[PDB]
Design a protein around this ligand. Structure first.
Ligand SMILES: CNC(=O)c1cnc(Nc2cc(C)c(F)cn2)cc1Nc1cccc(C(=O)NCc2ccccn2)c1OC
Ligand SMILES: CNC(=O)c1cnc(Nc2cc(C)c(F)cn2)cc1Nc1cccc(C(=O)NCc2ccccn2)c1OC
Lengths: 258, 256
């Protein structure tokens, strides 16, 4: 399951963002490590249980491209997951700031590294369920000459099962359409993230309204094809409404290495 | 000497601070993110000292030395266009992270500062403004197994063009021989290592100009660093006799 952390061992620093029912802060863990604290909102037992399952999944795994989870601190109305601090933070933010100046090869190295960590979770028959640019952290940047990127996939936060329909609609286009009303969902998540990467942090449908987003899935519309034809075949296969028709990560990984 | 930049190619954004006769702003260069060092309305000797600074930085190349794009000169305007280093001045970071900066982190910063100064020593060039504020953090070195990465900024208006009042303001970083050679950067380095050790708090910093001048006039020596890891190096560097200061080749070997 997961390691337990005392309130005394953690220091909450600057605010980094807000997730689904969470607030993200930089922090210190006690000699002293830089950590990232995911503070759950005052929640019911079913919400908190979904949070512990997330901590468990991440605690019980080990992969070079998967972010480490130290444990969980239980403090009054808040629950605090203590996770790995990664030098450069989310990928989507860096993609928007570096818009137009990110090489194909850089995006191609990041695809393989994401497939590998997901291939690893596929072999263990485990589900991430929140693959998106925001959950991709850059350990090493790779935008500078002679540098190659190194990513770590973050924890998926509160499990998708505990979210309302409104919250699941907010996750379009990354949310697999079968989850709107299995490991197959991470292949859709992966395909949508590859489109976000290709479009330098701009996911299709991101700007559009919840009704427009729901309508797109309700009408079985397909997402745009990526700008780079090296991934067009892979994304079309991944972003199919039939879960069984999505390739395995073992296949995906072989297709990128060629 | 230096590259010339047109007024049209630069956009001045937010104000970051004030230096000796300058105002530091964030900006864009045609749009690449830069730092603009806007010289105050100055006389020709002041502007000439500003161009010499741009030259020194333009004509060098080092991994731990900040890049200078060029200078924009139009009417009374003198704008040095320099590299934007992600996290900014080291002294600011050090005060905000006071008590939580490891000894190992500081030695990295020290070796990298010593490297960019050994490089300038081999080319027989003078920086003349080594201080925490002129040390910029490119990479923070906060994640496990990662090291900080620094870049030494341009020294701003050359020390030669400054008044006595302005030189007194530079104590304890200003070498005492400059109060009334490459040897000065060894004092600058020594004083910066004390500032780093004391988490951004340089000794004498709070004290008055008369108190500061009095300290140098009376030949008093600066406090010894908290970490005995650098106590021998700083005592050697912060000697009033310029010739008695070790070379950066020596300093670098002592740090490795
Ligand atoms: C497991 N470790 C992590 O999560 C982690 C590690 N290191 C970081 N470093 C770092 C470093 C710098 C310099 C920096 F400026 C920012 N951050 C950031 C990390 N998290 C993180 C940070 C900020 C926002 C989010 C966030 O919006 N989360 C909620 C969300 C919204 C939408 C979709 C998905 N999730 C966030 O979570 C990914
Ligand atoms: C090559 N250009 C640089 O050095 C530079 C590059 N990147 C920066 N990034 C950055 C980033 C963040 C997040 C930030 F919040 C600020 N800045 C800041 C940079 N300069 C800079 C900025 C502000 C003040 C000074 C300054 O006090 N100068 C005058 C002075 C006073 C006393 C002693 C010596 N010099 C200053 O110059 C060092």
């Amino acid at each position: 399951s997961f390691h337990r952390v005392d309130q005394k061992e953690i220091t909450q620093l600057s605010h980094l963002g807000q997730g689904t029912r969470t607030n993200v802060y930089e922090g210190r863990l006690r000699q002293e490590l830089r950590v990232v604290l995911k503070v759950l909102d005052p929640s019911h037992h079913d919400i908190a249980l979904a949070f512990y399952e997330t901590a468990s999944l991440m605690s019980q795994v080990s992969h070079t491209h998967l972010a480490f989870v130290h444990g969980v601190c239980v403090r009054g109305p808040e629950n605090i997951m203590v996770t790995e601090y990664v030098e450069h933070g989310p990928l989507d933010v860096w993609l928007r700031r570096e818009r137009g100046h990110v090489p194909m090869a850089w995006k191609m190295v990041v695809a393989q590294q994401l497939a590998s960590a997901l291939s690893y979770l596929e072999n263990k028959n485990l589900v991430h369920g929140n693959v998106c640019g925001r959950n991709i952290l850059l350990a090493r940047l790779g935008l500078a000459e002679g540098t190659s990127p190194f990513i770590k996939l973050s924890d998926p936060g509160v499990g998708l099962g505990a979210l309302s329909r409104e919250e699941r609609v907010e996750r379009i286009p990354w949310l697999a359409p079968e989850c709107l009303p299995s490991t197959a969902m991470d292949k859709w998540g992966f395909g949508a993230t590859l489109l976000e990467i290709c479009f330098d942090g701009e996911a299709p449908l991101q700007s559009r309204s919840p009704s427009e987003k729901e309508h797109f899935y309700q009408r079985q519309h397909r997402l745009p094809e990526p700008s780079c034809p090296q991934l067009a075949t892979l994304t079309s296969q991944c972003l199919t409404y039939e879960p069984t028709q999505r390739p395995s990560f073992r296949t995906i990984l072989r297709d990128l290495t060629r």
